[PDB]
Curated annotation (Swiss-Prot):
The keyword Transit peptide does not apply. Binds 2 Fe(3+) ions per subunit. In the diferric oxidized state, His-71 does not coordinate iron but, in the reduced state, the iron 1 ion shifts by 2 Angstroms resulting in binding to His-71 and loss of the interactions with Glu-37 and Glu-128. Monomer. It is found in: Plastid, Cyanelle. Its main location: plastid. This is Symerythrin. There is a cross-link at residues 14-124 (3-(L-phenylalan-2'-yl)-L-valine (Phe-Val)).
Length: 177
């Protein structure tokens, strides 16, 4: 059962935090992904938006990026000593970032570049808000880590808001008049 892969592999920018038995390790994985989104993924989407002639959508992605760093920093405050390193999958994503950056004028000139960037943002925001962070919050609570559970609950709310922002932006982008 073969499906075509997305235009320029843009879907592979989405990175999911990894599930563990221990809430520290879920936190470490979250920090890693949220900082990748803050540092790498959303800034690249922002530049695709600007180069596409969509500076308002670019500003949205810059605003979201800052918030991803807030999520990371909330967790790092709770886990002051944790040493976060990029996994093989994050490193591969950062390589894809760099290859798209090198081709950024071609990606932006095609209407699909920004469309797929917004659809990929929607994909992560949906998975993180509806699946990954609820599961981390639930496990934190089960383990008696109330402060971390409450942090994950706040990140769930925030990622939900990002999903809504991204859907309204996508609805805009596509509607010409
Ligand atoms: Fe995120
Ligand atoms: Fe988000």
């Amino acid at each position: 059962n073969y499906n075509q892969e997305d235009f320029m592999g843009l879907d592979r920018f989405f990175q999911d935090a990894v599930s563990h038995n221990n809430t520290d390790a879920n936190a470490a994985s979250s920090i890693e992904v949220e900082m990748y989104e803050c540092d790498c993924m959303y800034p690249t989407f922002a530049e695709i938006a600007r180069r596409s002639g969509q500076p308002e959508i670019g500003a949205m992605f810059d605003a979201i990026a800052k918030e991803e760093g807030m999520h990371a920093q909330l967790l790092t405050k709770l886990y002051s000593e944790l040493e976060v390193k990029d996994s093989a999958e994050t490193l591969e994503a950062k390589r894809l970032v760099s290859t798209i950056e090198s081709q950024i004028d071609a990606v932006a000139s095609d209407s699909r570049g920004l469309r797929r960037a917004l659809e990929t943002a929607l994909e992560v925001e949906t998975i993180e808000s509806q699946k990954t962070y609820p599961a981390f919050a639930k496990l934190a609570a089960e383990q008696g880590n109330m402060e971390v559970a409450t942090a994950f609950e706040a990140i769930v709310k925030s990622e939900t808001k990002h999903a809504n922002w991204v859907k309204r932006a996508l609805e805009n982008l596509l509607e010409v008049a």
